[PDB]
Design a protein around this ligand. Sequence first.
Ligand code: CLA
Ligand code: HEC
Ligand SMILES: CC1=C(/C=C/C(C)=C/C=C/C(C)=C/C=C/C=C(C)/C=C/C=C(C)/C=C/C2=C(C)CCCC2(C)C)C(C)(C)CCC1
Ligand code: OEX
Ligand SMILES: [Fe+2]
Lengths: 34, 135, 80, 32, 334, 341, 451
Amino acid sequence: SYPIFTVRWVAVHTLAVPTIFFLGAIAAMQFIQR
Amino acid sequence: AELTPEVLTVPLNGKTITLTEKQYLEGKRLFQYACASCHVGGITKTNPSLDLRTETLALATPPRDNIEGLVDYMKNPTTYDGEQEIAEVHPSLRSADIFPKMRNLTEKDLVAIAGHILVEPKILGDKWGGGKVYY
Amino acid sequence: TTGERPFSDIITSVRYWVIHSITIPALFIAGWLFVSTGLAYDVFGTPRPDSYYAQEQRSIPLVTDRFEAKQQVETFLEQL
Amino acid sequence: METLKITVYIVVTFFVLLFVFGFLSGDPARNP
Amino acid sequence: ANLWERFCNWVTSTDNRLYVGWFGVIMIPTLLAATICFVIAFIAAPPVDIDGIREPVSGSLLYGNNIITGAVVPSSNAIGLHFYPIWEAASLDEWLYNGGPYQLIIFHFLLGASCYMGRQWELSYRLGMRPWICVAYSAPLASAFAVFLIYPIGQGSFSDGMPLGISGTFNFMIVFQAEHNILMHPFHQLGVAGVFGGALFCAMHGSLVTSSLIRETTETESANYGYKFGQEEETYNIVAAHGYFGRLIFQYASFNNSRSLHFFLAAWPVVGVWFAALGISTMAFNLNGFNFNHSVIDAKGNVINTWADIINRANLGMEVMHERNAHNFPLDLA
Amino acid sequence: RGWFDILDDWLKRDRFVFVGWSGILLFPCAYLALGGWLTGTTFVTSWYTHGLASSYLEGCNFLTVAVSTPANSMGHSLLLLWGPEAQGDFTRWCQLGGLWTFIALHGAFGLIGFMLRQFEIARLVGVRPYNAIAFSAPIAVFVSVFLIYPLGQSSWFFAPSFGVAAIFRFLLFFQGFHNWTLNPFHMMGVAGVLGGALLCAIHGATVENTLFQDGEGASTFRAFNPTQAEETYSMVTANRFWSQIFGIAFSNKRWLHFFMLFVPVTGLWMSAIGVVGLALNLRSYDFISQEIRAAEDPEFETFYTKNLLLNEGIRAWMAPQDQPHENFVFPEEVLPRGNAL
Amino acid sequence: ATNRDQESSGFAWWAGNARLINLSGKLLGAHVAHAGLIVFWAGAMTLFELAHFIPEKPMYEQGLILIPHIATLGWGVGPGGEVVDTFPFFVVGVVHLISSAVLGFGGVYHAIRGPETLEEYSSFFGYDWKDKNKMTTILGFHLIVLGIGALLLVAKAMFFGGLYDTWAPGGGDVRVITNPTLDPRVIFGYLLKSPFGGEGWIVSVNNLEDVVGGHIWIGLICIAGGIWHILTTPFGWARRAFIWSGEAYLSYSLGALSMMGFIATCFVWFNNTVYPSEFYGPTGPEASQAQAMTFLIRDQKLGANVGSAQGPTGLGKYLMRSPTGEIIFGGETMRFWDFRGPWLEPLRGPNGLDLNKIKNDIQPWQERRAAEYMTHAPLGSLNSVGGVATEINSVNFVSPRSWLATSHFVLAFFFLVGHLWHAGRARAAAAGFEKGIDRESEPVLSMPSLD
Ligand code: CLA
Ligand code: HEC
Ligand SMILES: CC1=C(/C=C/C(C)=C/C=C/C(C)=C/C=C/C=C(C)/C=C/C=C(C)/C=C/C2=C(C)CCCC2(C)C)C(C)(C)CCC1
Ligand code: OEX
Ligand SMILES: [Fe+2]
């Protein structure tokens, strides 16, 4: 019996949703041909 | 910019031969295999007079700003005026006995080192054969 | 001890991974398609490997202006 | 130089023998 | 009851105002020799030719230095790694010229600061303490090991040691970055993470304990008198500081255990400075920092310079200018 | 109980991460700055401000990425995205160094917001605001270096850039151009930081090696519950240890922990005063008495004049690359070089 | 399930290997599985080094630390450090890696399946840490085995092929060392050598005669010290000089290993006999003397008067004097004048370098070796860019010497810290205050004041 969409959910996701987006983006950079 | 046939055209003998992006990338690696321990960046570490610049190499005797002249250097290395013969101190295909990193260099693989030495000053600029002043 | 669901209880619940086995890979793919489809080179103006220099030119395309500086970058980009 | 060398050498070994013997002279014993 | 068991009753006694210990029978005469020779070399040593090329470097105060520019100049590069005591030299003035005082100081200081470490163990064993204040002193001591002994050994000369001087230190730092790229070495970066964190967690722990002091005094006198020495009550509320710092970041970033807190205060600068001393000790053997010179290149192959290429031009600036006359050859090998 | 009281309730509501009134100013601005660092170090070049590669997209690694400063031509332009230089264009704004001023100003406002948070939480948990007072030393370092130093110089370009190697540029800049090692205000900072790191290591290991035996296990961390009111370590033994090892010891545990607050905070505040001086190029560059001595005596060498020779090396070898706006075209013969290098 | 929480042992999970101090079967499987890890790495790295091996390239140009060790033994190398058969490298990789599964079996067996203590099943194998004559019996068994191991090296050197000699005539060759130095005034005269420059305590061992005979001396005193410690109990002066605890002997070993790692760092950095530069690359000393030689060679070939040629400072640019008087290489390499390699002993006469042996007597193999050793100095980066810190990314070279010295300095310093950790603790444990100070009997409140 707990909430789901707390303040902590926003603290978690506003960091960790662009973190995973950026980690997918930096991992796509490792295959850019020169 | 982009590596392109305008960069990959270099004098063969008064004729120009065109390198490919595979061949220039292969001969950078064969330059770093057997040549760039002394000739890093186009200089000579064991003789900082004789840089690997095109102007220096065009002025060597015989002319070594050609690909036929650089493969003739890698089979018969002379001094800068061509008088004395230095295959006992310089890596060559006459010195597979004493430079073991030269033994697996074929005639389609030396042309890429002759290709890399000529194409690279157009790529870097003054940096090829320029030394730490131009880093 | 403040009220929220414990992190021993969220990421271990399977409903988390019902959500997050299809959102954590989706944003890793979204970020991949930011770079792989080229949108990263267009949102922020970072040049491609064939966009630092013009074909023969080798100068640094450096800003020398302040209020004529957005048009100056575009002059360097129309050069490419 | 001939004299200060053996002067330092005796000084060093006397302090070093004081180091080695005193830790050999029951240093496990000297606990509260 | 001979004068040996009466001698060990003085050496090992905790009743001494300053504890001697058996490590202190080495520590005291070495560090007094390293302190008497230091201040004599800092005021009155004639100029040492450090680089072995007959260009003497004035280090002492009487020769036109102040305390900032004063140093004990490292031993001559002509000596190299050679043992240079006073009896190696023909005169004192020869021993003074070739930087013999530097080898006297650092061999008495390191042997005496190594024996400071075991003396720190030895009082902890006489007092019934847990023993690892010595282990934490191994972090500044390895650092002194590195820049005085290890970096000379790898580079092959006590002229490459850190000069016993304020601006001689800054010479040592500049030349080290020129030759070893110490900023790009991650072990130095863990060391900066050890001293920036060490200064952070000092000011953190210093301010969370000071924030949490129980009212025992009036505002008309100092809050320091709320502590009386030896008291059994804790002078600050550890629950309030954890309640403060836990709400400051989030509750689980916070050491609500005082022992787990002070292990972290112990271990973060110590493992930081351990790695940093391992930076100098590994760049002794020329395992230099990260060399990203001409790493980003474009499609044509033109070098796109980075921030590490701007450091490389600064690194080039110091290295073509350090010891302007010492190099006769194009590569700076050691 | 109106809407200010109700917003006071929800802001000071006891949650996982405490929001508070400062979180209106901390939590966007600290997140835009750190989110803008990661956005700039991943995706934004320095090819028009500096002529550099500084993002992961270009090929840089974590050491070599930075959000680089604006160009010198920008001056101390605030470089708002809507401002006259960017003109709304986000693609142009990242190229003109606009994300540097985005980070240096939101990070400025978040550091106010974190320092206000330290006040606001200490007012609610009932403790003294010494952590805010101790946080004045990272404020004054961030304010002097990232804001006051470029404001004293010609532009934002000479501020440090938000990057690992770019800070390393900035350290080597200040040696060559400012002789910042020789500055006495930086030495008080080195004495304060290394004194802090010493007092972190000493007090950490002193407490951890003077512990009272409160548990029957050989791992001592479970011998502490926090609701206890005993000293967990022997301050009497700790004072007698250091009185005979070092000569002096703390005997006041309140004065010890104030000295731990005092030493890195006074050090970082002294380094601020030097950098504010270096904003105006008020260096302790030279001891005038020694360069008078060394300019008419060519045999008086100290380590001081050796460092000044190194700084001439830095100032002429780094600057045609470090400062591209100046169009320093230094020939291969004006460069100060020792023999053979 | 004894000693597996902190409820039963009083050791946490991060010191959970300390739960095995009094569990002889489990501590045996800890050590045999770890012995299996070292022999795995000996195997798997040798395979990794030989799968990624170019026998054209020299060994130091390939990031190889273990192929140089097999090559120093005299296996698969011929004239001048050149590989003629990579199969003696491959066998050393296979015999180690396959043996790691046997020690991996026996480590896993004694740890997670066998009897937790050996004190019941086998009183010969069951040990108490504070049983002093049993602790020498295992010490005597392990001393004889290291005496067997230091005689196997003598066996390979004298019978089964000989070791690689850097000081073989005409360049380096694998040489059967048939007349080793049995003279103890030479073998133990190395021990009384100064560590400092020109003396180089035991790192200055410069021929394979003293190496083999030193391993006859070490190899037989370790046998005779094994027969000593098997047949005796510790004497009374030693019983009061040591803590007799499990962690105590660990700390004595940790302090011994910190000595050895700091010495092996110095061996791989300074010695080019037992670490030939054919395999490991030029030393720090070797490359700076090679640079001064290359330009001694180059400029005299242009007709420089290299003895009378002056530096900027008044010194000889090519040829100055050491502070003892020997004609040595000019430049900054004057710090490395105590360096002996075999590519410049044909220059060294009795005054140091002979100028008349420089003019008409420098062979082209020496010009080749000096130019090679200059461009393969043990300077390099952590991302393995060769050269100085201001060098560009073209040369993928860090010497094995730099890798081996720095790794065995990182390890040897921490093993000094680990000695200081464990020696302090084991003496605090034998006296009874490692868990803290008793509040009811605190010693300082029973200790008098200072002032
Ligand atoms: C490589 C070094 C190493 C080795 C050899 C060991 C060995 C051991 N540890 Mg230790 N430990 C280590 C590192 C190591 N540890 C590290 C890094 C930590 C911190 C995480 C710990 C923390 C720790 C704690 C807290 C405890 C131990 C315990 C133990 C012992 C028994 C484990 C057991 O019986 O439970 C059963 C173990 C398992 C079921 C895990 C299975 C793992 C298997 C054996 C892996 C190996 C398989 C191998 C590849 C097969 C090869 C053979 C095959 C080819 C035929 C054992 C001797 C325990 C102890 O003290 O015993 C009383 C214990 O409580 N360890
Ligand atoms: C170090 C031992 C070297 C290696 C490996 C290679 N080269 Fe070299 N090179 C070296 C020296 C000392 C000199 C100068 C020789 C002299 O005449 O005194 C050279 C010269 C050249 C030249 C001539 C340059 C000129 O100015 O005319 C060329 C073209 C050349 N080297 C090419 C070259 C190549 C292609 C290599 C790799 C296969 C190579 N060199 C290796 C020293 C060394
Ligand atoms: C092989 C070889 C060789 C040989 C060698 C040898 C012979 C060696 C030996 C060595 C040795 C033989 C060594 C010894 C050492 C010693 C030591 C290392 C010691 C230590 C000590 C201790 C540890 C002590 C401690 C203490 C004290 C101080 C006091 C108190 C008590 C006690 C006991 C605790 C040679 C070089 C020839 C060559 C090469 C090879
Ligand atoms: O002495 Mn002091 O610093 Ca080591 O590098 Mn080489 O030597 Mn000198 O140059 Mn850079
Ligand atoms: Fe505290």
